[PDB]
């Protein structure tokens, strides 16, 4: 029959979970965001559509840090994204409290994975309306991840989700082939600023505001930090220049 798509934990005859797929739709309808794993860290960037001149510039920050070494950016229903970081933050706090060492990126990823997957087990909850790109540096270098509303996640060389994920992935794959030896924090920051600018075409209608953050074992000491001032403007230029 039908109706297999009205309840969350229901398997359709083809073994799918429609409510989780519908969530993905809300994710694709959101701003484009990305991640780039360099040789000693990771960079995060995201598009911020400027609805009007009334939005105080540089204020409504989207990227979030977890603990002190993890960055998270997401596309889709923003409130769902914050909800997931709050959990992440509790998850990292708990882990550190018992084991003393800050939570390893892979371990953190599964914590978020298990939690999100949990919201696809009952019909009393709704799946998350976001795809998240998060990562950082730990005992064994850098790690970049992307988590889907289904709870699925993997390690990535580069990742993107949202409105212009195709343009993004396209550019990311190029970088992957042309740099088998690994990009650098400094370089990834500029590159990321470009991918965002290019990917902004699928939304060239509204003006936007770029946001970048990074976690580099050499540029930030393995601590997550936002790219501001000079370094930021330098990347905005590098983009505006290669956008023509």
């Amino acid at each position: 029959g039908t109706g297999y798509d009205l309840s969350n934990s229901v398997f359709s005859p083809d073994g799918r979970n429609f409510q989780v797929e519908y969530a993905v739709k809300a994710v694709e309808n959101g701003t484009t965001s990305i991640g780039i794993k360099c040789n000693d860290g990771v960079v995060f960037a995201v598009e911020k559509l400027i609805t009007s001149k009334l939005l105080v510039p540089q204020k409504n920050v989207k990227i979030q840090v977890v603990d002190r070494h993890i960055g998270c950016v997401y596309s889709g229903l923003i409130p769902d994204g914050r909800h997931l970081v709050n959990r992440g933050r509790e998850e990292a706090a708990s882990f550190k409290k018992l084991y003393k060492t800050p939570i390893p990126i892979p371990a953190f990823a599964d914590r978020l994975g298990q939690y999100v997957q949990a919201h696809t087990l009952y019909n009393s909850v709704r799946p998350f309306g976001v795809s998240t790109i998060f990562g950082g540096v730990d005992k064994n270098g850098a790690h970049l991840y992307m988590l889907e509303p289904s709870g699925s996640y993997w390690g990535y060389k580069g990742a993107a989700t949202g409105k212009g994920r195709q343009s993004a992935k396209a550019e990311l794959e190029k970088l992957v082939d042309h740099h088998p030896e690994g990009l650098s924090a400094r370089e990834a920051v500029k590159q990321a600023a470009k991918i965002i600018y290019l990917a902004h075409e699928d939304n060239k209608e509204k003006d936007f505001e770029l946001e970048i953050s990074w976690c580099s074992l050499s540029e930030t000491n393995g601590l997550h930090k936002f790219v501001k001032g000079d370094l930021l403007q330098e990347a905005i230029d590098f983009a505006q220049k290669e956008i023509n």
Binding site: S7, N123, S124
Partner: protein
């Protein structure tokens, strides 16, 4: 959510009837017939075993006559399993009463309790009612021999003779026709077998398809005695009353 699959077992019909109770009764109406007849010197409980076999161990079987107390017994019509749940809680109420007052529980008090439990599954909890109807035969020093009846609704009433289960309409007419206040236990025993014998949906009325019990006050003693007839005893009496 779950609301979708909630049958709502405890609501009123536009006519002011309880759906589940009515259907449970409809269920009981297909159960083996059970009869209860009160004489001046005792009570008689007779029931027809619904479905049997050559291989069914009748000596060890019990599906319609249960001992609740030393002075109270019930005849069951409906879901045996449901009945056993109530039987057990019934047996406990009796012992709690005994422990508290150091006197056997008056027959009505025990029936009202059990009926109250049934009434509950009728007003709250969202669970299906028990598909059971009881005929209580008991004795107490305040009303002597008593005969009661309770059904899925939780309603109970007293009788001189009554039946529950299949073809009660016919059975009740036959009893109303030949019952006399001055009867004697033996008269009652004979009437009970005659009634079943005429309402049976089976070929003949053999002993391997009957359950029989009597509550008398043994003249040579001064106390009450319950007797759950054994296969042979049922076979005997069946020959005497002329059913062979």
């Amino acid at each position: 959510g779950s609301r979708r699959y909630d049958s709502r077992t405890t609501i009123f019909s536009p006519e002011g009837r309880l759906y589940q109770v009515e259907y449970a009764l409809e269920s009981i109406s297909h159960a083996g017939t059970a009869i209860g007849i009160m004489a001046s010197d005792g009570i008689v409980l007779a029931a027809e075993r619904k479905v049997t076999s050559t291989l069914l161990e009748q000596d060890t079987s019990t599906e319609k006559l249960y001992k609740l107390n030393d002075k109270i017994a019930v005849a069951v019509a409906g879901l045996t399993a449901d009945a056993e749940i109530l039987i057990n809680t019934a047996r406990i109420h009796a012992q709690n009463y005994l422990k508290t007052y150091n006197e056997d529980i008056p027959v009505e008090i025990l029936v009202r309790r059990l009926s109250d439990i049934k009434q509950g599954y009728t007003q709250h909890g969202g669970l299906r009612p028990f598909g059971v109807s009881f005929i209580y035969a008991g004795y107490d020093d305040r009303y002597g021999y008593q005969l009661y009846t309770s059904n899925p609704s939780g309603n109970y009433t007293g009788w001189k003779a009554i039946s529950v289960g299949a073809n009660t309409s016919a059975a009740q007419t036959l009893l109303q026709m030949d019952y006399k206040d001055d009867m004697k236990v033996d008269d009652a025993i004979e009437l009970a077998l005659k009634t079943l014998s005429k309402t049976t949906d089976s070929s003949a009325l053999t002993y391997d398809r009957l359950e029989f019990a009597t509550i008398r006050k043994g003249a040579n003693d001064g106390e009450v005695y319950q007797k759950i007839f054994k296969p042979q005893e049922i076979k005997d009496i069946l020959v005497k009353t002329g059913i062979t």
